[PDB]
Paper text:
Here, we explain the mechanism by which the phage [name] non-virion RNAP (nvRNAP), a bacterial RNAP homolog, recognizes the −10 element of its deoxyuridine-containing promoter in the template strand. The [name] sigma-like subunit, the nvRNAP enzyme core, and the template strand together form two nucleotide base-accepting pockets whose shapes dictate the requirement for the conserved deoxyuridines. The catalytically active [name] nvRNAP core enzyme consists of four proteins that, when pairwise concatenated, show about 20% sequence identity and cover the entire lengths of the universally conserved β and β′ subunits of bacterial RNAPs. Promoter-specific transcription is performed by a five-subunit holoenzyme that, in addition to the nvRNAP core, contains the product of [name] gene 226 (gp226).
The structure of the promoter complex has been determined by both X-ray crystallography and cryo-EM to resolutions of 3.38 and 3.80 Å, respectively. Where required, we will distinguish the X-ray and cryo-EM-derived structures of the [name] nvRNAP promoter complex by referring them as [name] nvRNAP-Pro-Xray and [name] nvRNAP-Pro-cryoEM, respectively. In the most populous class of the cryo-EM reconstruction and in both available crystal forms of the [name] nvRNAP promoter complex (i.e., [name] nvRNAP-Pro-cryoEM and [name] nvRNAP-Pro-Xray), the enzyme bound not one but two copies of the [name] promoter-containing forked oligonucleotide—the downstream copy (as designed) and (fortuitously) the upstream one—resulting in a superstructure that resembles the complete transcription bubble found in open complexes formed by other RNAPs. In the structure of the same complex analyzed by cryo-EM, only three nucleotides of the promoter (3′-−11UGU−9-5′) were sufficiently ordered for model building. The −8U nucleotide is partially disordered in the [name] nvRNAP-Pro-cryoEM map. The cryo-EM- and X-ray-derived structures of the holoenzyme in the promoter complex were very similar and could be superimposed with a root mean square deviation (RMSD) of 1.84 Å between 2563 and 97% of all Cα atoms comprising the holoenzyme. Although weak, the X-ray electron density and cryo-EM map of the upstream oligonucleotide stretches from the σ2-like part of the gp226 NTD to the gp226 CTD.
Residue numbers in the entry:
A (entry chain D): 99 to 292
B (entry chain d): 1 to 426
C (entry chain D): 584 to 631
D (entry chain C): 1 to 649
E (entry chain D): 390 to 534
F (entry chain A): 291 to 406
G (entry chain c): 51 to 484
């Protein structure tokens, strides 16, 4: 599908950026989307919790990944923790995509299932920052689906509050920067000298 | 071709016909005739018969004394220091009355009085001017020497500083803007200086201290006007000059619409029946064969509840007109390219209770918004000649990316439409 | 000489841009930025 | 930050002492914090529903919350005994009651509305109080009247149960959009009550909107419904010229001041400041002369009814009763003049309370419990929506379709668990309904309840064995009809993942429903829906030409607040960056002409208005003039006040 | 806005040193020695006032591994154990030799010795420096185009 | 606050359209107006009557030229009907002062007892 | 004293052109009495004030509108801010500020210590000079309890100083001739060293042996610190002392959790605060163990403000009869003072709710903003908007206002406030200090 953008840009420059070819391309976009809608209704796209459960019995490697807790008998730095999560998350995308399942078309197109976000639902979360950026030295050992604990709950609440404070502050001071640059860099003009 | 700012002279545009001499703005339970809120000069508040332009300005006469120009005061305070303690009178006295000279601590020239400061201004400058640190300021004052001392202080109309004489049972209440307090102080002071008629050597301690105090209030007037009307964000400079409110406008919500070209939208019945209000009356008047007064009351009844006679005239308007009715749609705030577009109208919703604007899904990504419940602003465009200049902002012209020259990625398949094609294409 | 974007506009040569940006009191009372000698034309002068 | 080390999970075991406002939402230990924190605001903004129902999956915590919220129901503090009851209107009436343990006296007033805020309210479902009559006895636990939320047996409820499925419908569910069947829209409802204050002076009159000249009905009656969204219109009258002005009072004129409102009028009250002798003769002021008189009659009644109580030697009365008695005895006296806003008005002023039912319309918002906020986009007849036509229970139809794209991306897997639980409940309910006598039927239920919440089994067994045969049969029939309730706690005590795995494994006869014309297995469950306050008509605004500010620029006018107009005629301002983004195009003269002719120059505005009104409607070729704008004059005046001028060249 | 919404952040490797690895296996925000017999010798001037908590932070020290000794160059700041600091005031306080003596044999086995805090590498840090280039005049003043 | 502008503009345009139609119908020229005005000023009674008759369609403005055109239409329309006294009264000027008179109950009785 | 007056009455028919209001409101009458006494005049002033009454135990009804009271959360006091230790008070926020200083002994050893100043009345003044003015030199030495360790010796005594006691008792310079005798064991503790540093900072080069025992010697110094004119240097200073004895009121006495011995008056409070300066400054701020909730004291503010404004004017009067000014203090008391000031300043929050679920929405809601609130949007104090591990178990970590995070939460319904502690979450402070 990414090859489509290369096709359109090979059409504009072929006909010399004419005003007529812009209208025709504007017509193609409308017709392509309308016929796309009919496929969704007839075929249907669903998300079901039973889809994950059914896959567990057939594929043994998936069962171990679902119930995975960080071993606590070995010393691990904060660099090794990130290595484990990336190692496990990478293997998840290989098994799901290669084999048939409900979510096969959700991953191959890569539109709706972000690689990092989807890992938190299945695999463990890891570590979270605090109000002052310092890393909290209490990594979460349980995935979202498997459940949470009270000590882990407090760490999660810190992350949510930081989003509200940052979002509110950025809204108050958002257009301050764009006003300064826009006022100055406006008087430029193009001449046609060779 | 090029705007330029420079100083002005008060004595050239002075008008003798209108001037203000009164202390109490209120007399006989009404606004006075020669006060600050006078109706003879500045006009009337809620009366349109007077037809007095805002540019009308008033004058206050000060004579024969002179004052330092308030605009130039901050410059002079930097050219030489200690101006606050050089135009003030602090004469001491012994028991009998003989003056005691305590000038040992003070400088050679201090506490001389304003009326003597003006006479010997040329000689006083040379003593305390630094030629290696304030070279620019020194040359500026030499060029503009006539406007150092002013004679008359202007005052603008009350249309910008309103005041109400609303009455109540507990007693009459008067409310005004803060600037009026200082304007009523300078008039009172000057009125209390010219009482002397017979030729008499006025005592210095009775007249000189008042002149210095008056200049203090004159300086604060310039600070107040520039710190409350122009400098602030809510001031007139950044609210009514570079931005403005505007008529012929509406606000609405977003609701997805399918099965139509990419530049066709459908507006609710109510908003389109009032934005294009004036053109509707013109169409009704000719067909129905009635004058404008009779047609107006017909349009009033056709907007309270949904009907059919008005709708038939509505549909024909968007079909026969040149170019089709169009409007500019933007989003608060605009920070991204294409946040404001130039769309077209192609459908009118039959329902009366519907109050949502129906747009396509592809065009949504351009605004970088979503259906969370944001409110847009709609501004129609009328002039035919003006339309051709705005056509460059249409979504057709944004199809090519200005950044690189390739096909723009924003006006492409996004969200579920990407998934739908992949199922069929593979 | 290169300048900060805030001081580049104030110490420029235009008049319309200076008054509509910031620091109204500083530009009109004193002459640190020398507002009295900026006569360059601009496309935004039509508003004034 | 190492202060976390003080927190220990040993003590926080089996007790929900660390949750505020999250007690209602179940499975709170699954969703993240960013989505959970939205639930508090969503619960803070939730309007009342007419057909409120208790949730199917309850957290066992809402009952106490409902009991301890005293803003919706009023019970009897102590055992009372009815003394008297008197009428005031068609609906509203009051009653005076006496204690049996202290000798004090109190009052209870029956109403038909409540003004929670400027727009939203509810309607009292006063049923028990009406049945009380003729010196009965009120017990300690009895409830006089209650809101629409509370059901018959004090069970709380703040939403509805709707059949739902995850599906995509013609890309109409992009981002956050919801389609909904017509039956669900009929089920969902809302209330609305507003108060309007009309004013009349000596000069003004009221037009004969309703009725002919025989009955000069200026305003609607007590129980009638208003028409054309016009409650009353008053026209100014001048002494100098009235011969050609009052020729026909049955039609609107050019200079009128009508009042707009919608609904059904329930309550009125009129306050007057004119002598009655002058009001007795005016024919047009007829209907008022009726109501006022009736009102006074009511007051006289109380002065002749309980005057033996307060004025007697007992005097054991509560503060409310004494205050009401003094207020009602104020009116019947002479030489009394009211005041409003610390001022003495001349003409009389009344009050109107209007009630209306607003159905669900396009543009509204509905959210679930887990903060899966959505927006209604397009409603359909129930025929179009997907249906199952292959299984044993053919006929079930989904009522709402949600976006399937943003479920995992939103990081909240609770909705899947709830839908799966309700689907398993549906299957087990159908299996129980298929066959089985009452002797073993309950067993089929108990097994299912054994693997979901072990705490519920004991209460199930106790309640089942407590009843007799007939009530047990009735309860089984009721659970067959509606559905098996499933209880699980928010934080400690619920199903996770292994329990779901085991539950799925045990039941091997379960398959997805096969819809018609879909060719993809699908599951339909039941979910909880709560309406939200946000509405499209509360922010929609348009403006053609309203009142202008003193300077000359358009400005906000306060007329919508007093119900003098339909739309909030407020203009939208062009921001700091809007002008620049418009100036993105190299054309600037067109921008200047547009701004000057729209909101700067008066002569240009008038010329444009005239040229648009008269001429050619199909094609417009306006030609603006050149006249110095107002803003230029304002700036020149201010600058010459400062002492500086702008010089060209 | 969007990138900052990604709460999860990356971590950077830290080179503790040869003698650091041979004697202390660091687990998260904790430090444990191989053998408790070896003591630690710290001079008076080593301690410095912390920027935030005002506690004593000894960035560099040399362990007193009996007769042998190897200097330690800790890349990050170190916080002394709360338990051991209680006895440091009088017992372990060694002003006579101008060098504190901390006998690890006094410390019990499997106990905390030193806690260190680490700041994550903010993904928004490069974006901020772009803004600072225009205004702060830190780098733009003393360079050509 | 000041009044609105749309209603005023509509009323003024209605007056303009009405005077244009009056010109069109009777092909009146400016010479007719010169010979009909006689240079007389505006008195109150004629203004009141003109406001009375043309009240339903629109309202009378303050411009004297439009008022005199509407008065010529007044005279033509009420002379072509059965009325005779009113056109003659409105034709020429009026007395500077309005005469005072008693109750005139006899003529008042005549008008009252009339079915009109 | 003051009391609530009865309001129940049965109206009797009258003809006096009575005025009644259209809208309903509920009020209650409070009567206060004062006895103004003079040489001959002994006037008695009885004032009456209207205060809204709590109906339905939840809301006030004023002018036909409904208003919901809300709790306010604020620190108990004696907390720490940037380079300062502050104690909240009704109207006068006494604050202690610390600054580092350098000193050299006789042998030339250099020490860096701390000196504390009371930033009261817009000035920087050493905290020891107040005690030196009130109780005197010897009086202050006895009062602190360090008089057995502090001595002053002259030049001749310095010549005859104990050589073997030089190491045991460190001798510090006072003037070119006068020396100070103090023990090294007393000098061991930093908190003890604070007093020595402040005492050495108070004195100057010019001194007289007999001037030390005279209170006026530094009373005039305090006056010169306050008033520059030499004529009034005495008198003005005296006034300050009087004011310094009235800074603390009864409510702050009742609120504080310290024992009785450290609660007699302002001087005892200052002594107890300065004895344990290090431990107090080492504590944190965000902990909940030292915070409380108020409901009415933040509603009775305007009356206190008006009384303070009235009393300052009569305190700053000169060469006039006092009785007239004292009468003018109480002359203006409007029956609608409290209601108007409360409504106009938006102290109460307008009731704007749409749902019937009121338990979690408005019954239990606390805001950190309002009068005497450190929270401020423009101040950008992100520390106050965060969370602390002490929040869990006694507050809601989830419910936050989307408009301004951290400024509004919700109390946990299971919270059990300890009885007879004036709305205190705990019964002991965060730092035991035991």
């Amino acid at each position: 599908l990414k090859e489509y953008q290369n096709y359109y840009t090979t059409l504009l420059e072929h006909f010399g950026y004419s005003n007529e070819i812009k209208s025709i391309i504007k017509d193609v976009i409308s017709e392509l989307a309308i016929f796309s809608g009919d496929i969704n209704v007839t075929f249907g796209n669903t998300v079901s919790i039973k889809s994950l459960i059914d896959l567990g019995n057939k594929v043994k490697r998936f069962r171990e990944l679902l119930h995975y807790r960080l071993p606590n008998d070995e010393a691990l730095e904060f660099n090794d923790i990130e290595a484990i999560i990336k190692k496990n998350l990478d293997e998840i995308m290989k098994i799901l995509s290669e084999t048939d399942n409900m979510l096969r078309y959700y991953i191959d197109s890569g539109a709706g299932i972000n690689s990092k976000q989807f890992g938190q639902v299945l695999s463990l979360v890891g570590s979270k920052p605090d109000l002052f950026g310092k890393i909290i030295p209490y990594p979460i050992n349980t995935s979202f689906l498997r459940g949470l604990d009270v000590r882990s709950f407090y760490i999660n609440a810190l992350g949510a509050r930081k989003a509200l404070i940052t979002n509110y502050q950025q809204v108050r001071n958002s257009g301050y920067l764009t006003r300064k640059i826009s006022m100055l860099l406006m008087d430029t003009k193009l001449i046609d000298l060779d | 071709m090029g705007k330029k700012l420079s100083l002005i002279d008060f004595n050239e545009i002075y008008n003798e016909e209108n001037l203000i001499t009164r202390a109490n703005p209120i007399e006989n339970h009404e606004f006075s005739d020669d006060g600050i809120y006078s109706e003879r000069i500045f006009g009337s508040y809620n009366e349109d018969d007077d037809d007095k332009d805002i540019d009308t300005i008033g004058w206050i006469n000060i004579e024969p004394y002179y004052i330092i120009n308030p605009i130039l005061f901050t410059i002079i305070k930097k050219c030489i220091p200690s101006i606050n303690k050089i135009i003030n009178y602090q004469q001491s006295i012994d028991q009998n009355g003989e003056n005691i000279d305590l000038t040992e601590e003070i400088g050679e020239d201090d506490y001389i009085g304003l009326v003597k400061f003006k006479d010997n201004f040329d000689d006083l400058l040379e003593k305390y001017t630094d030629k290696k640190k304030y070279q620019k300021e020194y040359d500026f004052l030499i060029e503009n020497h006539d406007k150092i001392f002013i004679n008359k202080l202007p005052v603008f109309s009350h249309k910008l500083r309103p005041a109400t004489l609303l009455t109540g049972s507990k007693g009459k209440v008067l409310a005004f803007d803060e600037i009026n307090n200082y304007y009523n102080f300078v008039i009172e002071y000057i009125n209390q200086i010219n009482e002397g008629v017979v030729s008499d050597d006025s005592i210095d301690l009775l007249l000189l201290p008042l002149l210095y105090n008056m200049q203090f209030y004159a300086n604060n007037i310039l600070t107040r006007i520039i710190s409350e009307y122009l400098r602030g964000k809510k001031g007139f400079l950044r609210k009514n000059i570079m931005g403005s409110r505007i008529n012929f406008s509406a606000r609405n919500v977003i609701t997805p619409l399918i099965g139509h070209p990419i530049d066709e939208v459908a507006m609710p019945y109510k908003t389109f029946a009032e934005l294009y209000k004036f053109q509707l009356i013109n169409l009704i008047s000719k067909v129905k064969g009635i004058n404008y007064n009779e047609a107006l009351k017909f349009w009033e009844k056709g907007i309270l509840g949904f009907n059919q006679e008005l709708y038939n005239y509505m549909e024909e308007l968007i079909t026969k007109t040149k170019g089709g009715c169009t409007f500019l749609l933007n989003r608060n705030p605009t920070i991204s390219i294409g946040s404001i577009l130039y769309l077209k109208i192609g459908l009118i919703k039959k329902d009366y209770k519907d109050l949502t604007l129906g747009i396509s899904n592809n065009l949504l990504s351009a605004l970088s918004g979503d259906y969370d419940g944001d409110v847009l602003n709609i501004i129609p465009v009328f002039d035919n000649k003006m339309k051709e200049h705005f056509s460059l902002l249409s979504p057709q012209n944004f199809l090519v990316d200005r950044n690189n020259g390739r096909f723009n990625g924003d006006f492409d398949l996004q969200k579920d439409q990407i998934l739908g094609i992949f199922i069929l294409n593979n | 000489e290169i300048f900060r974007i805030t001081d580049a506009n104030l110490k420029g040569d235009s008049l319309s841009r200076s008054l509509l940006f910031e620091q109204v009191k500083k530009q009109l009372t004193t002459l640190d930025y020398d507002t009295f000698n900026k006569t360059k034309s601009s496309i935004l002068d039509k508003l004034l | 930050m190492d202060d976390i080390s003080v927190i220990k999970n040993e003590d926080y075991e089996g007790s929900h002492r660390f949750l505020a406002e999250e007690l209602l939402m179940p499975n709170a230990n699954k969703t993240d914090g960013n989505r959970s924190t939205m639930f508090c605001s969503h619960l803070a903004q939730a309007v009342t529903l007419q057909k409120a129902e208790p949730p199917l999956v309850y957290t066992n915590f809402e009952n106490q919350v409902g009991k301890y919220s005293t803003a919706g129901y009023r019970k009897a503090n102590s055992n009372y005994k009815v003394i008297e009851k008197i009428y005031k209107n068609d609906y509203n009436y009051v009653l005076i009651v006496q204690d049996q343990e202290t000798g004090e006296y109190t009052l209870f007033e029956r109403a038909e509305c409540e003004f929670l805020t400027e727009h939203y309210g509810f309607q009292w479902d006063n049923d028990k109080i009406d049945s009380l009559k003729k010196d009965d006895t009120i017990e300690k636990d009895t409830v006089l009247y209650k809101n629409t939320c509370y059901d018959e047996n004090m069970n709380f409820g703040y939403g509805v149960n709707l059949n739902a499925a995850y599906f995509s419908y013609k890309n109409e569910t992009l981002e956050d959009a919801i389609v909904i069947s017509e039956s669900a829209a009929k089920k969902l409802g809302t209330f609305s009550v507003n108060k309007v204050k009309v004013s009349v002076n000596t000069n003004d009159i009221l037009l004969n909107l309703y009725g002919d000249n025989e009955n000069y009905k200026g305003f609607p009656d007590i129980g009638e419904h208003i028409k054309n969204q016009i409650i009353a219109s008053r026209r100014r009258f001048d002494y100098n010229t009235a011969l050609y002005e009052l020729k026909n009072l049955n039609e609107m004129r050019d200079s009128d001041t009508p009042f707009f409102a919608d609904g059904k009028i329930v309550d009125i009250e009129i306050f007057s400041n004119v002598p009655e002798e002058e009001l007795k003769v005016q024919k047009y002021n007829e209907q008022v002369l009726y109501y006022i008189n009736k009102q006074k009659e009511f007051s006289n009644n109380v002065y002749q009814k309980l005057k033996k109580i307060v004025e007697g030697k007992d005097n054991n009365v509560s503060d409310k009763l004494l205050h009401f008695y003094n207020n009602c005895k104020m009116r019947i006296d002479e030489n009394i003049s009211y005041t409003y806003q610390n001022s003495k008005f001349s003409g009389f002023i009344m009050e109107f309370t209007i009630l209306e039912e607003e159905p669900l319309n396009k543009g509204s918002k509905i959210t679930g419990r887990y903060g899966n906020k959505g927006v209604i986009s397009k409603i359909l007849p129930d025929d179009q929506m997907p249906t199952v036509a292959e299984g044993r229970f053919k006929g079930l139809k989904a009522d709402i379709c949600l976006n399937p794209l943003g479920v995992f991306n939103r990081l909240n897997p609770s909705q899947l668990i709830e839908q799966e639980l309700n689907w398993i409940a549906k299957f087990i309910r159908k299996d129980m309904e298929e066959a089985g006598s009452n002797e073993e039927k309950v067993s089929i239920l108990l097994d299912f309840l054994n693997r979901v919440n072990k705490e519920e089994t004991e209460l199930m067994e106790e309640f089942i064995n407590s009843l007799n045969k007939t009530e047990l049969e009735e309860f089984l029939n009721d659970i067959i009809e509606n559905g098996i309730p499933i209880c699980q706690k928010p934080f400690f005590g619920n199903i996770g993942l292994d329990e779901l795995w085991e539950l799925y494994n045990h039941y091997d006869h379960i398959d997805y429903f096969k819809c018609e014309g879909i060719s993809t297995p699908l599951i339909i469950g039941e979910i909880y829906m709560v309406r939200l306050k946000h509405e499209p008509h509360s922010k929609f605004s348009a403006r053609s030409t309203s009142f202008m500010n003193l300077r000359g620029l358009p400005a906000k006018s306060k007329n919508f607040k007093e119900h003098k107009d339909l739309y909030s005629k407020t203009p939208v301002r062009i921001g700091n960056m809007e002008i620049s983004n418009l100036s993105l195009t190299n054309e600037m003269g067109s921008i200047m002409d547009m701004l000057n002719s729209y909101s700067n120059n008066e002569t240009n505005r008038r010329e444009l208005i005239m040229q648009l009104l008269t001429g050619n409607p199909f094609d417009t070729n306006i030609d603006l003039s050149d006249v110095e704008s107002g803003t230029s004059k304002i700036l020149k005046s201010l600058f010459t006040c400062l002492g500086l001028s702008i010089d060209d060249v | 806005l969007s990138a900052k919404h990604l709460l999860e952040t990356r971590s950077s490797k830290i080179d503790w040193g040869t003698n650091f690895e041979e004697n202390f296996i660091v687990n998260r925000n904790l430090i444990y020695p191989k053998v408790y017999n070896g003591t630690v010798i710290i001079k008076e001037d080593d301690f410095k006032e912390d920027e935030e908590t005002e506690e004593q932070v000894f960035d560099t020290f040399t362990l007193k591994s009996g007769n042998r000794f190897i200097s330690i160059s800790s890349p990050m700041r170190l916080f002394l154990n709360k338990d051991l600091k209680k006895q440091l005031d009088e017992s372990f306080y060694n002003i006579e030799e101008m060098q504190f003596e901390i006998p690890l044999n006094k410390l019990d086995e499997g106990d905390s010795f030193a806690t260190f805090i680490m700041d994550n590498n903010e993904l928004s840090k490069p974006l901020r420096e772009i803004k600072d280039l225009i205004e702060t005049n830190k780098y733009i003043k003393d360079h050509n185009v | 606050l000041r009044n609105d502008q749309g209603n005023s503009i509509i009323n003024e345009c209605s007056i303009k359209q009405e005077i244009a139609k009056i010109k069109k119908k009777y092909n009146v020229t400016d010479e007719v107006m010169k010979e009909f005005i006689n240079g007389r000023e505006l008195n109150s009674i004629q203004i009141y009557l003109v406001k009375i008759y043309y009240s339903n369609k629109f309202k009378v403005n303050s411009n004297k030229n439009d008022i005199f055109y509407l008065l010529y239409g007044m005279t033509r329309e009420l002379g072509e009907m059965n009325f005779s006294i009113i056109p003659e009264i409105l034709s020429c000027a009026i007395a500077p002062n309005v005469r005072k008179m008693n109750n005139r109950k006899k003529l008042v009785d005549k008008i009252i007892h009339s079915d009109k | 004293g003051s009391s609530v007056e009865p309001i129940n009455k049965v109206y009797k028919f009258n003809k006096e052109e009575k005025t009644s209001d259209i809208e309903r409101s509920e009020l209650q009458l409070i009567k206060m009495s004062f006895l103004i006494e003079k040489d001959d005049k002994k006037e008695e002033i009885n004032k009456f004030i209207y205060f809204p009454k709590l109906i339905d135990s939840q809301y006030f009804i004023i002018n036909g509108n409904r208003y919901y009271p809300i709790y306010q959360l604020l620190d108990s006091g004696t907390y720490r801010t940037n380079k300062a230790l502050t104690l909240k008070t009704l109207l006068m926020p006494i604050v202690l500020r610390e600054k580092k200083e350098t000193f050299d002994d006789i042998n030339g050893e250099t020490h860096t210590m701390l000196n504390v100043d009371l930033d009261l009345f817009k000035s920087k003044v050493p905290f020891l000079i107040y005690f030196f003015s009130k109780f005197g030199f010897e009086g202050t030495l006895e009062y602190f309890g360090l008089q057995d360790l502090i001595h002053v010796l002259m030049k001749e005594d310095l010549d005859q100083l104990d050589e073997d006691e030089i190491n045991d008792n460190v001798i510090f310079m006072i003037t070119k001739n006068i020396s100070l005798v103090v023990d090294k064991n007393f000098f061991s503790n930093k908190n003890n060293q604070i007093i020595i540093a402040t005492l050495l900072n108070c004195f100057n080069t010019r001194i007289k042996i007999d001037k030390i025992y005279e209170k006026d010697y530094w009373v005039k110094k305090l006056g010169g610190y306050f008033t520059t004119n030499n004529s009034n240097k005495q008198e003005k200073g005296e006034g300050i002392i009087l004011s310094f004895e009235r800074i603390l009121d009864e409510w702050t006495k009742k609120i504080l959790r310290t024992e009785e011995k450290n609660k007699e008056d302002i001087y005892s409070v200052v002594r107890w605060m300065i004895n344990n300066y290090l431990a107090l400054v080492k504590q944190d701020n965000m902990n909940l163990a030292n915070k409380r909730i108020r409901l009415y004291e933040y509603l009775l503010h305007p009356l206190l403000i008006k009384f303070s404004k009235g009393t300052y004017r009569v305190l700053n009067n000169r060469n006039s009869n006092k009785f007239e000014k004292i009468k003018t203090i109480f002359s203006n008391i409007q029956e609608g003072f409290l209601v108007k000031k409360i409504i106009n300043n938006e102290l109460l929050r307008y009731d704007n709710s749409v749902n019937s679920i009121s338990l979690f929405t408005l019954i239990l809601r606390y805001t950190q903003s309002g009068p005497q609130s450190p929270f401020s949007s423009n101040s950008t104090n992100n520390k106050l908007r965060g969370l602390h591990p002490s929040y869990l178990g006694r507050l809601g970590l989830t419910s936050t206002s989307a408009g301004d995070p951290g400024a509004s939460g919700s109390l946990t319904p299971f919270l059990e406030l300890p009885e007879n502690s004036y709305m205190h979450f705990t019964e002991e402070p965060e730092i035991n200090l035991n």
